[PDB]
Amino acid sequence: DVTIAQQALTHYDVSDNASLRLLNLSENATYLVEDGEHQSILRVHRQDYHQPHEIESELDWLAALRTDSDVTVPTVVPARDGRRVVTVDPADVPRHVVHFEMVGGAEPDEESLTLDDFQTLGRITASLHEHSQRWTRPAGFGRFSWDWEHCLGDTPRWGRWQDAEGVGASETALLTRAQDLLHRKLEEYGSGPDRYGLIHADLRLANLLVDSSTPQRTITVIDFDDCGFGWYFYDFGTAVSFIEHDPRLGEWQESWVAGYRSRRELPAADEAMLPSFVFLRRLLLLAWMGSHTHSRESATKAISYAAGSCALAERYLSSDGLRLT
Ligand code: NA
Ligand code: NA
């Protein structure tokens, strides 16, 4: 994808011979572009995940967040013809590219919020929810959904968690029972406008870049590429991506909730669904892991993640879905 990034440079005012540094951000290939003093960020979208109008819809939310919310987000750099999404075609399908202004914290080594910063993540998430709830979306807005069907049902976007390495007979029993309880809890919770709407859907600590390691600093939310319709509190599950099994989960939750409630109400019935959303994220990430596992080395990691998913499932089942610790 480096050659795609180079092709894309010709569409921007930054020199075509600018240096490119691959950054450790996003499932897409994202590069720090350096042209003498100038720094900027080039995102090369992976193949087949979005159509261009969907990317344009993400960028429309970013534009509204920039002007109408207190959340700091990326600023798009238009191409030389004014367009926001550059599509480039090599031989052997076309690839979409978006160019952003430099973000504090993106220069290697990339600096983001840490495990000490769940509260700040919660507060920023509440601000994203508040904006989403009041924003009148453009005509023609289009983004995909993180509903049951597209997570765990008939059209799973990251594949089946059942197919991951390490997910055998005993694990599939535990995980299916907990999944089915989660499904029933989600059906009861419903998808009314107070509970479901436009979300970032990847609000991991690593996606909030900072210009300082000490609080009171500029925090930029990056990587809106999974944004779409889903449960608002699924964003909390994403906050603990890959770390759901840590014994500190309860402390992290309390910190995140304190930050969230500083900006937006978090009612008891929503707080009571936070473990469900953690478990939803866990199954999704187990599916993602399985989709990208096909070796002995990858298998050991999937095996261990599957085992921690089962420990969480047992806690979920024994508490009737109310607790993971
Ligand atoms: Na992502
Ligand atoms: Na299996």
Tab-separated table of C-alpha atoms and ligand atoms in Angstrom:
chain	number	residue	atom	x	y	z
A	1	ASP	CA	0.000	0.000	0.000
A	2	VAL	CA	3.057	2.253	0.048
A	3	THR	CA	2.904	2.599	-3.738
A	4	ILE	CA	-0.755	3.609	-3.416
A	5	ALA	CA	0.263	6.262	-0.908
A	6	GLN	CA	2.903	7.527	-3.338
A	7	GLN	CA	0.433	7.597	-6.225
A	8	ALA	CA	-1.927	9.586	-4.025
A	9	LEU	CA	0.693	12.247	-3.275
A	10	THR	CA	0.458	13.565	-6.809
A	11	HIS	CA	-3.113	14.701	-6.021
A	12	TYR	CA	-2.029	16.977	-3.163
A	13	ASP	CA	0.138	20.059	-2.903
A	14	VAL	CA	2.672	18.257	-0.739
A	15	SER	CA	5.712	17.231	-2.785
A	16	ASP	CA	5.368	13.956	-4.688
A	17	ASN	CA	8.759	12.963	-3.213
A	18	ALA	CA	7.659	13.616	0.389
A	19	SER	CA	8.793	11.036	2.893
A	20	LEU	CA	6.264	8.491	4.140
A	21	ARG	CA	6.408	6.746	7.530
A	22	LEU	CA	3.931	3.961	8.287
A	23	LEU	CA	2.126	4.703	11.572
A	24	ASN	CA	0.861	2.098	14.051
A	25	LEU	CA	-2.711	3.324	13.859
A	26	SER	CA	-5.857	1.943	12.225
A	27	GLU	CA	-6.591	-1.251	10.288
A	28	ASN	CA	-6.003	0.916	7.203
A	29	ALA	CA	-2.470	1.876	6.210
A	30	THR	CA	-1.864	5.363	7.656
A	31	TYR	CA	1.303	7.347	6.911
A	32	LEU	CA	3.027	10.383	8.351
A	33	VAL	CA	3.847	12.612	5.366
A	34	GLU	CA	6.898	14.853	5.816
A	35	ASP	CA	7.893	17.517	3.280
A	36	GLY	CA	10.567	19.688	4.848
A	37	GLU	CA	8.675	21.396	7.675
A	38	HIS	CA	5.219	20.245	6.565
A	39	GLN	CA	3.653	17.249	8.329
A	40	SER	CA	0.339	15.595	7.468
A	41	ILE	CA	-1.379	12.202	7.576
A	42	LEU	CA	-2.418	10.023	4.641
A	43	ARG	CA	-4.966	7.216	5.194
A	44	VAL	CA	-5.089	4.460	2.530
A	45	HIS	CA	-8.359	2.528	2.911
A	46	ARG	CA	-8.165	-1.210	2.824
A	47	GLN	CA	-9.823	-2.943	-0.096
A	48	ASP	CA	-13.568	-3.614	-0.226
A	49	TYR	CA	-14.527	-2.322	3.246
A	50	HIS	CA	-16.279	0.905	2.177
A	51	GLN	CA	-17.667	2.561	-0.910
A	52	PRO	CA	-16.678	6.202	-1.429
A	53	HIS	CA	-20.059	7.661	-0.443
A	54	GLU	CA	-19.743	5.889	2.922
A	55	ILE	CA	-16.337	7.489	3.487
A	56	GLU	CA	-17.829	10.849	2.506
A	57	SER	CA	-20.477	10.326	5.217
A	58	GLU	CA	-17.745	9.775	7.845
A	59	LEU	CA	-16.116	13.005	6.670
A	60	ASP	CA	-19.459	14.847	6.948
A	61	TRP	CA	-19.656	13.827	10.613
A	62	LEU	CA	-16.081	14.996	11.170
A	63	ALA	CA	-16.941	18.345	9.618
A	64	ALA	CA	-19.941	18.758	11.943
A	65	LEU	CA	-17.917	17.702	14.997
A	66	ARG	CA	-15.220	20.249	14.104
A	67	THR	CA	-17.584	23.205	14.053
A	68	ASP	CA	-20.328	22.165	16.506
A	69	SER	CA	-18.788	20.061	19.264
A	70	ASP	CA	-16.020	20.364	21.827
A	71	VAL	CA	-14.448	17.120	20.609
A	72	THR	CA	-11.226	17.621	18.650
A	73	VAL	CA	-11.223	15.524	15.443
A	74	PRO	CA	-9.097	15.321	12.264
A	75	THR	CA	-9.292	18.001	9.583
A	76	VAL	CA	-9.473	16.799	6.000
A	77	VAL	CA	-6.935	18.180	3.497
A	78	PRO	CA	-8.689	18.458	0.120
A	79	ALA	CA	-6.927	17.279	-3.006
A	80	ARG	CA	-5.816	19.677	-5.727
A	81	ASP	CA	-9.270	19.520	-7.353
A	82	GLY	CA	-11.064	20.108	-4.069
A	83	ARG	CA	-12.291	16.601	-3.413
A	84	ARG	CA	-12.014	14.953	-0.032
A	85	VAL	CA	-11.650	11.301	-1.101
A	86	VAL	CA	-8.985	10.479	-3.708
A	87	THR	CA	-9.449	7.152	-5.502
A	88	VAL	CA	-6.392	5.711	-7.199
A	89	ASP	CA	-6.281	2.799	-9.595
A	90	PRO	CA	-3.310	0.510	-10.127
A	91	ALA	CA	-3.534	-2.463	-12.493
A	92	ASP	CA	-4.541	-5.814	-10.933
A	93	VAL	CA	-9.929	-2.682	-7.605
A	94	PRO	CA	-9.544	1.075	-7.023
A	95	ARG	CA	-8.374	2.227	-3.572
A	96	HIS	CA	-9.674	5.223	-1.644
A	97	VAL	CA	-7.413	7.672	0.187
A	98	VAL	CA	-8.103	10.540	2.609
A	99	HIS	CA	-5.497	13.161	3.616
A	100	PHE	CA	-5.661	14.791	7.064
A	101	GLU	CA	-3.808	17.620	8.792
A	102	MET	CA	-1.148	16.662	11.310
A	103	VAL	CA	-2.479	15.528	14.706
A	104	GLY	CA	-0.587	16.052	17.954
A	105	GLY	CA	0.563	12.659	19.194
A	106	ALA	CA	0.830	10.989	15.785
A	107	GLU	CA	4.572	11.382	15.250
A	108	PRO	CA	6.378	8.178	16.282
A	109	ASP	CA	6.313	6.994	18.876
A	110	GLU	CA	2.567	7.631	18.733
A	111	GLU	CA	1.136	8.925	21.990
A	112	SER	CA	-2.408	8.195	23.115
A	113	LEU	CA	-4.473	7.970	26.272
A	114	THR	CA	-3.350	5.187	28.649
A	115	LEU	CA	-4.932	2.930	31.220
A	116	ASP	CA	-4.808	5.925	33.591
A	117	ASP	CA	-7.225	7.805	31.319
A	118	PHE	CA	-10.490	5.868	31.148
A	119	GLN	CA	-12.328	8.844	32.669
A	120	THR	CA	-11.185	11.194	29.899
A	121	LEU	CA	-12.218	8.595	27.322
A	122	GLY	CA	-15.670	8.366	28.899
A	123	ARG	CA	-16.116	12.138	28.913
A	124	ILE	CA	-15.150	12.438	25.223
A	125	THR	CA	-17.464	9.544	24.338
A	126	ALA	CA	-20.377	11.363	26.026
A	127	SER	CA	-19.626	14.425	23.925
A	128	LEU	CA	-19.709	12.300	20.747
A	129	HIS	CA	-23.034	10.846	21.819
A	130	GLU	CA	-24.465	14.284	22.578
A	131	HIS	CA	-23.456	15.545	19.125
A	132	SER	CA	-24.828	12.454	17.397
A	133	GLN	CA	-28.172	12.790	19.213
A	134	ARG	CA	-28.712	16.369	18.086
A	135	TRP	CA	-27.109	16.346	14.633
A	136	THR	CA	-29.458	16.475	11.704
A	137	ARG	CA	-27.674	14.281	9.181
A	138	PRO	CA	-27.219	15.242	5.515
A	139	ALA	CA	-29.537	14.032	2.862
A	140	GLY	CA	-27.968	10.920	1.456
A	141	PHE	CA	-25.968	10.088	4.600
A	142	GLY	CA	-25.056	6.415	4.565
A	143	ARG	CA	-23.146	4.280	7.032
A	144	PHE	CA	-23.321	0.599	7.950
A	145	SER	CA	-24.765	-0.812	11.179
A	146	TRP	CA	-23.403	-2.622	14.219
A	147	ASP	CA	-26.752	-4.279	14.909
A	148	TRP	CA	-27.286	-7.918	15.872
A	149	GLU	CA	-27.421	-9.073	12.240
A	150	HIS	CA	-24.075	-7.509	11.338
A	151	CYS	CA	-22.237	-8.421	14.546
A	152	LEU	CA	-23.300	-11.960	15.528
A	153	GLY	CA	-26.311	-12.812	13.349
A	154	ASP	CA	-26.804	-13.679	9.712
A	155	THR	CA	-24.404	-11.152	8.118
A	156	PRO	CA	-21.406	-10.896	10.533
A	157	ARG	CA	-19.023	-8.219	9.286
A	158	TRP	CA	-15.909	-9.739	10.894
A	159	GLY	CA	-16.975	-13.351	10.417
A	160	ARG	CA	-18.077	-15.927	12.980
A	161	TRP	CA	-16.433	-16.104	16.403
A	162	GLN	CA	-17.346	-19.794	16.239
A	163	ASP	CA	-14.720	-20.267	13.516
A	164	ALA	CA	-11.764	-18.869	15.477
A	165	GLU	CA	-8.884	-21.100	16.479
A	166	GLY	CA	-9.340	-22.216	20.048
A	167	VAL	CA	-13.128	-22.211	19.814
A	168	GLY	CA	-13.948	-25.884	20.197
A	169	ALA	CA	-16.782	-27.872	21.739
A	170	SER	CA	-16.612	-26.649	25.359
A	171	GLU	CA	-15.844	-23.070	24.388
A	172	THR	CA	-18.636	-22.898	21.820
A	173	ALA	CA	-21.101	-24.156	24.453
A	174	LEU	CA	-20.109	-21.479	27.020
A	175	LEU	CA	-19.871	-18.705	24.475
A	176	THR	CA	-23.167	-19.609	22.715
A	177	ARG	CA	-25.080	-19.674	26.000
A	178	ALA	CA	-23.713	-16.261	26.961
A	179	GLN	CA	-24.296	-14.962	23.402
A	180	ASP	CA	-27.923	-16.064	23.519
A	181	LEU	CA	-28.440	-14.346	26.902
A	182	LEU	CA	-26.850	-11.212	25.432
A	183	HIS	CA	-29.257	-11.417	22.473
A	184	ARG	CA	-32.246	-11.578	24.837
A	185	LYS	CA	-30.915	-8.630	26.841
A	186	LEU	CA	-30.422	-6.582	23.687
A	187	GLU	CA	-33.950	-7.382	22.520
A	188	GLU	CA	-35.354	-6.185	25.845
A	189	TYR	CA	-33.117	-3.062	25.894
A	190	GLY	CA	-34.295	-2.300	22.388
A	191	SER	CA	-33.004	0.149	19.855
A	192	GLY	CA	-34.964	3.285	20.663
A	193	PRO	CA	-33.508	6.719	19.956
A	194	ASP	CA	-32.160	7.085	23.514
A	195	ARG	CA	-30.147	3.878	23.137
A	196	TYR	CA	-29.135	3.503	19.463
A	197	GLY	CA	-27.791	5.899	16.829
A	198	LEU	CA	-24.643	7.139	15.105
A	199	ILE	CA	-21.445	6.058	16.976
A	200	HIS	CA	-17.680	6.053	16.401
A	201	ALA	CA	-17.587	2.296	17.246
A	202	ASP	CA	-13.785	2.085	17.805
A	203	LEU	CA	-13.175	4.249	20.887
A	204	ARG	CA	-10.173	2.386	22.156
A	205	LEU	CA	-7.629	4.368	24.176
A	206	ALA	CA	-5.187	4.063	21.259
A	207	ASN	CA	-7.554	6.104	19.039
A	208	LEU	CA	-7.380	9.229	21.268
A	209	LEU	CA	-4.082	10.847	20.420
A	210	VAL	CA	-2.544	13.396	22.801
A	211	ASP	CA	-0.036	16.229	22.634
A	212	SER	CA	0.989	15.703	26.295
A	213	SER	CA	1.383	12.786	28.700
A	214	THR	CA	0.052	14.950	31.586
A	215	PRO	CA	-3.675	15.816	31.764
A	216	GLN	CA	-5.201	19.003	30.434
A	217	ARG	CA	-3.920	18.539	26.888
A	218	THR	CA	-5.201	18.396	23.321
A	219	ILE	CA	-6.907	15.052	22.722
A	220	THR	CA	-7.803	14.197	19.117
A	221	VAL	CA	-10.208	11.377	18.345
A	222	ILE	CA	-8.972	9.562	15.242
A	223	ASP	CA	-10.027	6.556	13.136
A	224	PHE	CA	-13.747	7.095	12.564
A	225	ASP	CA	-13.576	4.423	9.836
A	226	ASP	CA	-15.873	1.984	11.736
A	227	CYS	CA	-18.446	4.646	12.532
A	228	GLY	CA	-22.094	3.821	11.904
A	229	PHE	CA	-25.347	2.950	13.590
A	230	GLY	CA	-25.228	0.950	16.787
A	231	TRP	CA	-25.936	1.003	20.506
A	232	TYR	CA	-24.486	4.094	22.154
A	233	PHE	CA	-23.039	2.043	25.018
A	234	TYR	CA	-21.337	-0.379	22.665
A	235	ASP	CA	-18.723	2.400	22.591
A	236	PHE	CA	-17.865	1.383	26.182
A	237	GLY	CA	-17.141	-2.173	25.036
A	238	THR	CA	-14.782	-0.721	22.480
A	239	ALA	CA	-12.958	1.243	25.257
A	240	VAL	CA	-11.744	-2.079	26.696
A	241	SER	CA	-10.893	-3.730	23.361
A	242	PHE	CA	-8.541	-6.711	23.849
A	243	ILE	CA	-8.294	-6.054	27.622
A	244	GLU	CA	-11.833	-7.122	28.618
A	245	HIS	CA	-10.473	-9.938	30.841
A	246	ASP	CA	-8.298	-7.700	32.970
A	247	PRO	CA	-9.181	-7.793	36.720
A	248	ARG	CA	-9.202	-3.987	36.779
A	249	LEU	CA	-12.299	-3.849	34.475
A	250	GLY	CA	-14.579	-2.725	37.333
A	251	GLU	CA	-12.302	0.194	38.225
A	252	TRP	CA	-11.952	1.184	34.577
A	253	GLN	CA	-15.724	1.096	34.190
A	254	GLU	CA	-16.261	3.329	37.235
A	255	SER	CA	-13.717	5.847	35.913
A	256	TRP	CA	-15.245	5.855	32.420
A	257	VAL	CA	-18.748	6.263	33.828
A	258	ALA	CA	-17.676	9.191	36.049
A	259	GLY	CA	-16.235	10.926	32.981
A	260	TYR	CA	-19.281	10.153	30.832
A	261	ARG	CA	-21.749	11.439	33.412
A	262	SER	CA	-19.835	14.742	33.636
A	263	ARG	CA	-21.199	15.519	30.131
A	264	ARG	CA	-24.280	13.317	29.540
A	265	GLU	CA	-26.626	11.251	31.659
A	266	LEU	CA	-25.908	7.519	32.024
A	267	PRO	CA	-29.044	5.957	33.526
A	268	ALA	CA	-29.077	2.822	35.651
A	269	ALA	CA	-30.564	0.691	32.895
A	270	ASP	CA	-27.741	1.674	30.560
A	271	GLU	CA	-25.116	1.137	33.246
A	272	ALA	CA	-26.600	-2.332	33.745
A	273	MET	CA	-25.924	-3.072	30.059
A	274	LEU	CA	-22.219	-2.169	30.160
A	275	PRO	CA	-21.132	-5.782	30.817
A	276	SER	CA	-23.303	-6.896	27.885
A	277	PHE	CA	-21.521	-4.423	25.616
A	278	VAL	CA	-18.105	-5.554	26.818
A	279	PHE	CA	-19.124	-9.131	25.996
A	280	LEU	CA	-20.435	-8.095	22.556
A	281	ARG	CA	-17.064	-6.458	21.804
A	282	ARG	CA	-15.242	-9.556	23.079
A	283	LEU	CA	-17.093	-11.872	20.663
A	284	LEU	CA	-16.568	-9.454	17.810
A	285	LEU	CA	-12.831	-9.277	18.462
A	286	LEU	CA	-12.630	-13.054	18.755
A	287	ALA	CA	-14.254	-13.236	15.310
A	288	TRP	CA	-11.815	-10.629	13.996
A	289	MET	CA	-8.894	-12.582	15.470
A	290	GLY	CA	-10.135	-15.820	13.850
A	291	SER	CA	-10.511	-14.084	10.489
A	292	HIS	CA	-6.823	-13.084	10.689
A	293	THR	CA	-5.435	-16.322	12.199
A	294	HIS	CA	-4.032	-19.062	9.972
A	295	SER	CA	-0.736	-20.178	11.562
A	296	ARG	CA	0.641	-21.944	14.643
A	297	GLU	CA	1.786	-18.616	16.133
A	298	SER	CA	-1.483	-16.823	15.535
A	299	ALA	CA	-3.336	-19.854	16.859
A	300	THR	CA	-1.752	-19.661	20.322
A	301	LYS	CA	-2.914	-16.065	20.669
A	302	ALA	CA	-6.458	-16.921	19.518
A	303	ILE	CA	-6.504	-19.905	21.894
A	304	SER	CA	-5.666	-17.653	24.827
A	305	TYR	CA	-8.161	-14.962	23.800
A	306	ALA	CA	-10.830	-17.612	23.416
A	307	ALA	CA	-10.041	-18.923	26.921
A	308	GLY	CA	-10.391	-15.448	28.431
A	309	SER	CA	-13.664	-15.025	26.517
A	310	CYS	CA	-14.950	-18.202	28.189
A	311	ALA	CA	-13.991	-16.915	31.648
A	312	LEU	CA	-15.968	-13.743	30.905
A	313	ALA	CA	-18.893	-15.824	29.566
A	314	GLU	CA	-19.070	-17.833	32.791
A	315	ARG	CA	-19.174	-14.648	34.872
A	316	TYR	CA	-21.849	-13.192	32.543
A	317	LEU	CA	-24.003	-16.306	32.837
A	318	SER	CA	-23.661	-16.638	36.614
A	319	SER	CA	-24.799	-13.031	37.125
A	320	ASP	CA	-27.712	-13.168	34.649
A	321	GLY	CA	-25.782	-10.797	32.434
A	322	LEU	CA	-25.162	-8.140	35.064
A	323	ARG	CA	-21.435	-8.595	35.858
A	324	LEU	CA	-18.201	-9.740	34.245
A	325	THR	CA	-16.037	-9.553	37.352
B	1	NA	NA	-10.460	0.889	13.739
B	2	NA	NA	-15.129	-23.610	16.233
